[PDB]
């Protein structure tokens, strides 16, 4: 854990 | 690949219609990892999916955190002007 992905 | 500009606009209820990955404390790039339908992104063309988002409205991204990239790309309103390169 620890990469995300973040939408915008 | 080639360095390309390309511009939207954003209402300001709207969001950009994207989502980004990577960061600094990842050794890579903000990254464009989707393009969500109907949304600003989508209805303009020109930004894909693995595209490295080097600098939005002249702020640079190539050296920020994931978490000071969403900062930044959540802060633009208006014109949005993207410089993005497929990595």
Same mark, same amino acid.
């Given at each position: 854990?620890?990469? $995300?992905?973040?939408?915008? | 690949?080639?360095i390309?500009?390309?511009?939207?606009?954003?209402?300001? /209820?709207?969001?950009?219609? $994207?989502?980004?990955?990577?960061?600094?404390?990842?050794?890579?790039?903000?990254?464009?990892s989707? $393009?969500?339908?109907?949304?600003?992104?989508?209805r303009?063309?020109?930004?894909?999916?693995?595209?490295?988002?080097?600098?939005?409205?002249?702020?640079?991204?190539?050296?920020?955190? /994931?978490?000071?990239?969403?900062?930044?790309?959540?802060?633009?309103?208006?014109? $949005?002007?993207?410089?993005?390169?497929?990595?």
């Amino acid at each position: 854990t620890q990469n $995300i992905c973040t939408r915008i | 690949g080639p360095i390309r500009k390309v511009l939207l606009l954003k209402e300001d /209820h709207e969001g950009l219609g $994207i989502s980004i990955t990577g960061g600094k404390e990842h050794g890579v790039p903000i990254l464009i990892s989707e $393009i969500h339908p109907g949304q600003p992104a989508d209805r303009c063309g020109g930004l894909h999916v693995g595209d490295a988002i080097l600098a939005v409205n002249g702020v640079n991204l190539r050296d920020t955190k /994931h978490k000071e990239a969403v900062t930044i790309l959540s802060q633009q309103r208006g014109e $949005i002007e993207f410089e993005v390169v497929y990595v």
